[PDB]
Amino acid sequence: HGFVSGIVADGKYYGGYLVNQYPYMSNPPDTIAWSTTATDLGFVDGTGYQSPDIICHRDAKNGKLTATVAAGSQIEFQWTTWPESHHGPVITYLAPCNGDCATVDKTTLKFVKIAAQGLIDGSNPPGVWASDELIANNNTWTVTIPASYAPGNYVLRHEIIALHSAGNLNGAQNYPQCFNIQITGGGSAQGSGTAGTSLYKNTDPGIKFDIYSDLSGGYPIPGPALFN
Template identity: 60%
Template sequence: MSFSTVAFAASALALLSTVSAHGTVSGIVVDGKLNTGYSPSFQFSNPPPVVAGWSIPEDLDNGFVAPAKFQDPDIICHVGATNAGTSITVAAGSTVDLQWTTWPESHKGPVIDYLASCYGECETVDKTSLKFFKIGEEGLIDGATAPGNWASDKLIANSNTWVATIPADIAPGNYVLRHEIIALHSAYDANGAQNYPQCINLIVTGSGTAEPAGVVGTELYKSTDAGILIDIYKTLASYVIPGPALYNSGAAPAPVESSAATVAPTSIVAPSTIAPSTIAVPTTSTGAPFPFTNSTAPAVPTPTATFPGVPNDSVDAPELPTTTSAPVVVAPGTGDDEDIVTGTTTAVATASQQPEVPSVCDSAATVTVTSAGATVTVAAPATTVTVTVTASAKPLPSGATFDDVLSWFSNGVKNAAAGGRRRHARAVRL
């Protein structure tokens, strides 16, 4: 394995672990059919897939839009968003299930849905001309204990899926659905709220005639709105959801000031075990026994990677803890200045149910043994683990190479990540 390959794998893992920290809408379910949404991995495809989700290739860090940019076009459909190349047909009065790749529990806040008529083709509409009317909103569910239980927690508990309902009375035509989570974990500071808008093209069918008035995206919010500048770490009796009034199509609207009973988030714990492997590692020792010492392996996050040329609908690395413990055994070498290191790694991952997505990870690892204190360090591109050293060993399989060692370790990392992937989401929780 060349140095350039190792360097690429390390940099790609670092980028993708950052990209997947917040998530994107990777799946849109209408009438039981799963439609692919936008994925950051599309920027590596030539040509990229044609999907109904608006593209945001400039959002390389999967970041947010801050209040300082509420009057900037970036607030409409996210940073540098460009029109989607196709649309999804949905009947007025039906639901649209919006599947996020992941969402961090710490990023608490409201979930809001808007529609805007394109008055023509949504594939070519000027986004600054779109006038949005609010069709759904939910904010604080229970504020009895700070920071409270929020719509974002409800989304997480429903396998990172939110259900939006298309008003039954709106006129048929081409619309942009604007789906948004506003994270309030830093909203106690001016410019601290974080908006994460996502846009999807829809073709709405039906016999309705309503054409609700809307507001252009750059006028939806102000940085001083009560629901934007707020401290969620204080006990809240209610919360004013930002944005224009909710459109009432005859059904009972959600309250603007929200407070209700607690809905507890749920999760799935998926234990995953990586088989032991035995590796021979060159050291500075001449074969003399090591003075053994012990240390404890810290918790290690498990990365999930997607690389250029590999079709992938989402980059899914839930921001949830994955604990890896790795007892390693070192014994004196039998010659050629080598010592035998035996390692067993067990990973326990907290996973959310998402569609299984193929991943390709060309990971690299190095194993270093120093005689002073007999510390064994296992380093991967994104992690370093110091492990326990004891005194039993098995020989390396005949003919094995150091590249074999790197491959075994890489496969272990991928297997641990695979244990934490989400299966198909069910639109039941949000």
Template identity: 55%
Template sequence: MLPIIAALGLISTAAAHGTVNAIVVDGTYYQGYNPSYQYITPAPVTVGWKIPQDLGNTFIPPDSYGSPDIICHLGATNAMTAAATKGGSKINLQWTPWPVSHKGPVIDYLANCNGPCETVDKASLKWFKISAVGLIDNSMSNGYWATDQLIKNNNTWTVQIPTSIATGNYVLRHEIIGLHAAGQPNGAQNYPQCVNLAITSSGTDNPAGVPATSFYKATDPGIKFDLYSAFTSYTIPGPAKYSGALSVSQTMPAPPAATATGVYSV
């Protein structure tokens, strides 16, 4: 897990959207990855996958859905450690400030690394969907979306690990899709973020999953979508949700009770 790193105070805190800067698992805080960490020696050890090319907090467009960048973001490489997690654990993912204009769904996937996630080939990961929230209320202009709920809860989203999956080392792929320009071709904006989890569980399921490069097509109704039209519904893109997925209420999370130290795996 993570050391407490005094050098974090040197990193710019300028507001920007696009990255998960921390996660909290059952009250324990784990540092996520910040692209600025590439300028720190030694670099912080984080549960978040490294995306040093994402200095501009950019996105993955539909014409890159077949690229490895859609897996865990731009040029992503493996995280160096994992967060200790249990089947049934609730994970709060803390985003950098998210713009209210960037409305869209929040989607979560898991992939079993079948070994250490610190060295797994990301292209070999097979993902199954454990959470997906899109349009919550269409009674207001442009709708009330999962991203609006995330902003309301201090830029935080909660996902619960299924109790039915087997013990193992997993990558959690957490993603926002911004729809503010999705009415035009190649306009959707995908912001995938990955973190390593070492999950202990009484379950036995090993869902098959699919590669992230097969999740979406540019013509999917949840990708090519006019946010400013008179819509009444929204179809969340990607594969069907895993049968053992758990729903969780999105509420303001409590402050973390502890900060992780050391390195953990199962």
């Protein structure tokens, strides 16, 4: 349970979507972040993986602003305090808007996985995960925008998947947060993306997963192939 309160992109701070304030307003401030109705600081579980809610979280609507970021530079996501119990991977995606992200139809986005970390040390279950590294780093996560990525407008989809109840079907808890970015000073590369409602299934090996038993088999990070 948590959300992203802001990001630092190319050394500049951008306020996020303040989900405990902005839904409770007629005319909330413009942000690079997408709006959601996830006011419980909750999640999308396997019941919603083929619902448009999985794309940018519950009932999400376009952010009206866009942040610039140099290809090869870093984005830092600032989360509200993440529970240690909520062990799981941290995954980051880019989907091209092919024009202004403020007016892209979210159902048309095709996401490329540009970063992902999963199980760090499973020797003593439930083990140490990306989420735990996030906690250790002042509840922040940093990703590099590939220097080779083509300049353009993209939806940046950053997600924690908490696996503390993932042994049950539809038990994993997805926490996506979306942001509009413009990659500058890029190369020519772009991945082949996967629709938001095709990213995950409730029987995927990294989704229906028991963190509390022997982890000698590791952890297969879910979602489509990492861009190289």
